[model samples]
Target: IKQGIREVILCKDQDGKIGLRLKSIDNGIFVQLVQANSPASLVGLRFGDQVLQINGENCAGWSSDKAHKVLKQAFGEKITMTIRDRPFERTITMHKDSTGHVGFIFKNGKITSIVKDSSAARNGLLTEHNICEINGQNVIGLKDSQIADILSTSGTVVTITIMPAFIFEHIIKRMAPSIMKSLMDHTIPEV
Candidate 1:
């Protein structure tokens, strides 16, 4: 009883080529994370990822018209999806958790290079540091929404420390929206 959308279309890339895409649903659809280096494979999707939204609207159970509405709003903007993290047992690592407050990006063992004028970058925090905690809570394996949950409760100066040696190679830096600057300042960054 999960998948009830009207139509199903394969995922596509910016180049109009059919790519690995998924139809959204309430239970969340699983997708083979779009990998790098292949025909229309430039979309950096990940495994077990769920396509939550097309532009700014909920994609689950959406009809063609609804999809059109969502897609229209998403025009020229990269389609944003939510990743439903599946738990898998893995070996642990030992490192200091710099759990101060900072906007960060970590993917596939690499961190984004350019931080968009965020408080973390302003305070000299670099990419690749393990964010052990945020506002004094463990943030490891936390989702984006969860991270936002903690950062919203404080209004004082957000403190962040980072270690840039986590990975030898850097990942693609996803440009952050400008409102990210005031995210930790008790303000909601524009969604």
Candidate 2:
């Protein structure tokens, strides 16, 4: 369940990526990916963030294709999203070699960037992935320097667990398409 409504203005840089990947379902659109340091990320949006409205217009029941069309139309235009949050968690493991380089930038204990051909990138770690554990130690509330110290002192082949930005998509994929269709066919009144 979602808790509250949030307004977000999403835009792209000068011919650059907006840094957000959206996935639409029957009820609304969801934030699938948020690129690090991109406009979308700077706005503080996160993965699994559901969008209920677009530009103050109700978008309660829009299909993925339809939502994408609207977004494309809004490109380079003024856009605002009414969002609800539904975050989830995932785990990933990565390694660092003798050079003590895993080819990523960790800022505030979250994966801020992934260098091309680096271990993190090779392991399928994407930007916006939050580091939950390093070498089996919980780092949920640790500072950036503390996390960095753990990384520097850890052994090679370090195991890192991360929460990805697309857990809701995976959950939706596991449900029956027929079920989703049924939900789409009916509207439940809010109490």
Candidate 3:
């Protein structure tokens, strides 16, 4: 599924790389990794963006390997692509109950349960949705215990940002090393 479609034209650098990689998800292919400051990122191709077309051909059903080959073959030319927004990032505001609960249980920051008729249920939180941000804080690379800590201290209102766990893991795994370190160690940046 896609939100909408847009197009981009990529000219390969002399090294014949677009500074990006593609990966298959179900029957579609998506941007799996994009190098920072590279043409792909500079032109705004992004993580989870589905590659719906390549060089004017509809390629929604192509395997990632095939897609990669096509792009490789087109490296000598300007490659055109039709892209779409990834389908699953969502934000919801949840009201906590007496237990200071958002009515969900999680492990590894991935939702494992949603109590019926509870805030999480009513607000569209789904099982296996990986928690990304609690309030305004990014929770990537945080431990499950830290998620609980953030949740318990959120008072009566909690705002959550989530995406499908599969996509979440891919995004985390593909994160640049500097980014991974920043999140993993909770370093404060100089303003």
lDDT of 3 by residue, 1-191 (tens): 23689998988887887877777776788776665445676577655677888888877678777988988888566788889865556778999988788899888778998999899888878898887667745565567887788888887999887889877776555456555434232322222
Per-residue lDDT of candidate 2, residues 95-169 (tens digit): 785689878887655677888877888887878766655664545445678678888988777776666534433
State the weakest 10-residue window (summed lDDT) of model 3: 182-191
TM-score pick, better of 2 and 3: 3
Ten-residue stretch with the least lDDT total in model 2: 182-191
TM-score: model 3 vs. ground truth: 0.59
TM-score head-to-head 1 vs 2, winner: 2
* Per-prediction backbone clash count: 6, 0, 0
**Cα error, candidate 2, residue 120 (Å):** 26
Q: How accurate is candidate 3 locally (lDDT)?
A: 0.73
Q: Which of the numbered candidates is closest to the native, going by highest TM-score?
A: 3
Worst 10 residues of 1 by lDDT: 86-95
Candidate 1 lDDT: 0.38
Model 1 reaches what TM-score against the true structure?
0.28
Per-candidate TM-score against the hidden true structure: 0.28, 0.46, 0.59
Candidate 2 residue 12 C-alpha distance from true site, Å: 2.3
Of candidates 3 and 1, the better by TM-score = 3
